[PDB]
Amino acid sequence: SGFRKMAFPSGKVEGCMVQVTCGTTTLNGLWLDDVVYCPRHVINYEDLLIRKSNHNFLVQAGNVQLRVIGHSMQNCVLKLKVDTANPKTPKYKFVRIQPGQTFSVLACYNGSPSGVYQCAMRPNFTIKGSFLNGSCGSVGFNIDYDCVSFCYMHHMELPTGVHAGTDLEGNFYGPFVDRQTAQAAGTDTTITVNVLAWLYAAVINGDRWFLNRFTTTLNDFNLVAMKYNYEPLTQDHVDILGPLSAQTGIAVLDMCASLKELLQNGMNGRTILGSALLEDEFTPFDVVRQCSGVTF
Amino acid sequence: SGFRKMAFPSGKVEGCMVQVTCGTTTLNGLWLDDVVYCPRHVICTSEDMLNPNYEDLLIRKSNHNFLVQAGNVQLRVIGHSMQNCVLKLKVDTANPKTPKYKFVRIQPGQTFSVLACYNGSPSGVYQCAMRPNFTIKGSFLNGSCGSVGFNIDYDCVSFCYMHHMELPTGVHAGTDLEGNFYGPFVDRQTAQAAGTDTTITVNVLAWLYAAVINGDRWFLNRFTTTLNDFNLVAMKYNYEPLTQDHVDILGPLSAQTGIAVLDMCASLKELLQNGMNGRTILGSALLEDEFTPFDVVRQCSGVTF
Numbered sequence: 320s321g322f323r324k325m326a327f328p329s330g331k332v333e334g335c336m337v338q339v340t341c342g343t344t345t346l347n348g349l350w351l352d353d354v355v356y357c358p359r360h361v362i363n364y365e366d367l368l369i370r371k372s373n374h375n376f377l378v379q380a381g382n383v384q385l386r387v388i389g390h391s392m393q394n395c396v397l398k399l400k401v402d403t404a405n406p407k408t409p410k411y412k413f414v415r416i417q418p419g420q421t422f423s424v425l426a427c428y429n430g431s432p433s434g435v436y437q438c439a440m441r442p443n444f445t446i447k448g449s450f451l452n453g454s455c456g457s458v459g460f461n462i463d464y465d466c467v468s469f470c471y472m473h474h475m476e477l478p479t480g481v482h483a484g485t486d487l488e489g490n491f492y493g494p495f496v497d498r499q500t501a502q503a504a505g506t507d508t509t510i511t512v513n514v515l516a517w518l519y520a521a522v523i524n525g526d527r528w529f530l531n532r533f534t535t536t537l538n539d540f541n542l543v544a545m546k547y548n549y550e551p552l553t554q555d556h557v558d559i560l561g562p563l564s565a566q567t568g569i570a571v572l573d574m575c576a577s578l579k580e581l582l583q584n585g586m587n588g589r590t591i592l593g594s595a596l597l598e599d600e601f602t603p604f605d606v607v608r609q610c611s612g613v614t615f
Numbered sequence: 616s617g618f619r620k621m622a623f624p625s626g627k628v629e630g631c632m633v634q635v636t637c638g639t640t641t642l643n644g645l646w647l648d649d650v651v652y653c654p655r656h657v658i659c660t661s662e663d664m665l666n667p668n669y670e671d672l673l674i675r676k677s678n679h680n681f682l683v684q685a686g687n688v689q690l691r692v693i694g695h696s697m698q699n700c701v702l703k704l705k706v707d708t709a710n711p712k713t714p715k716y717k718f719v720r721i722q723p724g725q726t727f728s729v730l731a732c733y734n735g736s737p738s739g740v741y742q743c744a745m746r747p748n749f750t751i752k753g754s755f756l757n758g759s760c761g762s763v764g765f766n767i768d769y770d771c772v773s774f775c776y777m778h779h780m781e782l783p784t785g786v787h788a789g790t791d792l793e794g795n796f797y798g799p800f801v802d803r804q805t806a807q808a809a810g811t812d813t814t815i816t817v818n819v820l821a822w823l824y825a826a827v828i829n830g831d832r833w834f835l836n837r838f839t840t841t842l843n844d845f846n847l848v849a850m851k852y853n854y855e856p857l858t859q860d861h862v863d864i865l866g867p868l869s870a871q872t873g874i875a876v877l878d879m880c881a882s883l884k885e886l887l888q889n890g891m892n893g894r895t896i897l898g899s900a901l902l903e904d905e906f907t908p909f910d911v912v913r914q915c916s917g918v919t920f
């Protein structure tokens with residue numbers, strides 16, 4: 320029993336974190352094999368990079384200085400070829416995630432991991448992280464059995480306090496750019512498929528006060544979702560919620576009619592899984608995993 | 616900016632997790648140097664749990680009855696002893712991944728990270744607090760027994776909790792790494808129930824200071840309170856009494872934000888009276904009590920917004 324915001328064990332990622340210094344700027348890098356990946360803003364980026372030599376980049380792994388033997392840029396990521404392969408390199412992939420998907424973040428400062436938390440890629444492509452100055456280069460990941468799927472690298476904080484970054488190939492999530500200019504997060508929406516998954520988790524944990532005898536249609540429900548700034552629910556989302564629907568005996572449109580009543584009436588002084596708000600940062604897969612015991 | 620429930624990086628603890636099997640029971644163990652620490656109820660059957668005599672069950676065991684597995688390698692048990700509710704298995708190999716560590720017993724209100732494990736394999740990490748009623752609101756399934764709670768301030772891991780059981784309300788009970796339970800609980804299947812829980816007042820105040828640091832002041836008021844009057848009101852909402860120790864501990868946060876502890880106590884009094892009125896504090900519609908004053912100083916910036 321119990322339902323917590325759970326991150327993946329971070330150990331496989333801790334062994335890849337390094338400190339990258341270029342002049343006055345110091346941030347984090349990801350050391351995989353003989354390459355260190357870090358935000359290119361550590362340095363017209365091609366014109367600024369052409370003036371740099373390998374020895375201008377100081378890379379530190381624990382108390383050992385790594386020697387940079389080459390450098391190149393791939394989109395908004397700087398790739399530093401080093402003289403030593405990381406012996407702690409895990410099995411890995413670089414994956415680009417979609418809004419609504421969740422991941423773990425290992426927040427780092429000076430190449431030293433300080434904390435781990437779970438978060439989701441918002442529909443507006445920002446993340447509500449917890450980062451201070453020096454956190455740039457911190458990474459987001461998921462674990463699939465023994466393989467680490469790197470999906471995010473931290474680059475910046477927007478004026479509202481939310482965060483923006485890229486996949487490990489340097490492509491930003493969202494209409495953001497890596498430079499000081501007027502940038503703002505778009506109007507955010509609630510991840511509907513995730514709220515439904517969390518209502519199923521509550522039912523599994525013995526919280527059923529919100530269940531009712533009613534059902535609805537995808538058309539009728541999506542009109543309600545549009546009214547309350549909720550993301551549209553698709554047939555794909557309904558199909559993905561299938562296993563949870565069969566485990567609890569509550570049809571997805573049946574659970575949608577419960578969410579509709581929660582949206583139109585509120586919680587009436589009650590809580591669901593210790594929360595007075597409808598949680599949208601647990602995917603259907605996160606719920607199935609936390610209520611089964613999948614290990615890494 | 617931002618405020619998240621943050622756990623410590625778990626890597627130093629992952630390298631210590633092993634699987635301990637005794638007959639039909641399989642649970643988790645903590646391998647530090649040449650010793651594996653695990654709940655003593657691994658020697659029990661389900662029948663034994665009603666009124667177990669652990670000394671009588673353990674005397675019938677030999678070293679080779681305990682199967683310890685570290686990854687794909689079987690460790691050889693060369694000795695065993697019981698210390699309170701913990702079984703200590705002497706093994707033939709020291710853990711090369713043993714970090715710098717201490718065993719610390721924590722007080723209610725203190726927070727820690729939990730690395731939930733099954734079959735000696737870590738599945739997840741989350742942050743939680745020792746409730747005033749000595750239980751933890753964890754997320755554990757069958758096979759999680761032996762999972763540990765820890766803090767990693769600086770480079771040393773301070774082990775503070777080992778998971779033993781789930782109470783009928785869904786909350787969890789366990790021990791320090793010396794086998795002493797937190798709470799009036801026993802590793803026996805008897806009528807056991809968590810006492811009435813209360814809110815950790817010093818933690819809610821710390822979290823209100825974190826909101827001020829991050830830029831939010833809507834909840835503040837022009838009033839102050841005496842410490843005793845604050846406690847008379849807070850007790851009515853099931854809040855823990857706030858002591859002079861708690862006020863002293865909140866000193867640094869009070870000086871950083873310029874808001875006296877008793878003035879922050881007046882905002883909390885008002886918040887309890889009025890509710891939030893459709894507003895949130897650090898993305899929450901409830902008053903959070905699982906961030907200590909130390910956690911706030913650690914996570915938040917030194918410059919107030």
Ligand SMILES: CNC(=O)CN1Cc2ccc(Cl)cc2[C@H](C(=O)Nc2cncc3cc(F)ccc23)C1
Nearest residue numbers: 360450451452454455474475476496497498499616
């Ligand atoms: C709010 N930041 C600023 O005014 C200065 N910034 C300008 C800037 C511009 C483009 C890019 Cl790609 C990065 C940056 C830098 C930046 O976003 N770094 C930070 C990242 N994450 C949390 C951060 C919390 C902070 F308190 C400060 C700075 C953070 C630095």
Ligand SMILES: CNC(=O)CN1Cc2ccc(Cl)cc2[C@H](C(=O)Nc2cncc3cc(F)ccc23)C1
Nearest residue numbers: 320656664755756757759760779780781802803804
């Ligand atoms: C709820 N418990 C049971 O049905 C059986 N239990 C009885 C019992 C009694 C005393 C002691 Cl010290 C240990 C145990 C065992 C126990 O609590 N282990 C579990 C631990 N944590 C979460 C657990 C979730 C579960 F769903 C099952 C089992 C968990 C086994």
Ligand SMILES: [Cl-]
Nearest residue numbers: 720721722725
């Ligand atoms: Cl303590």
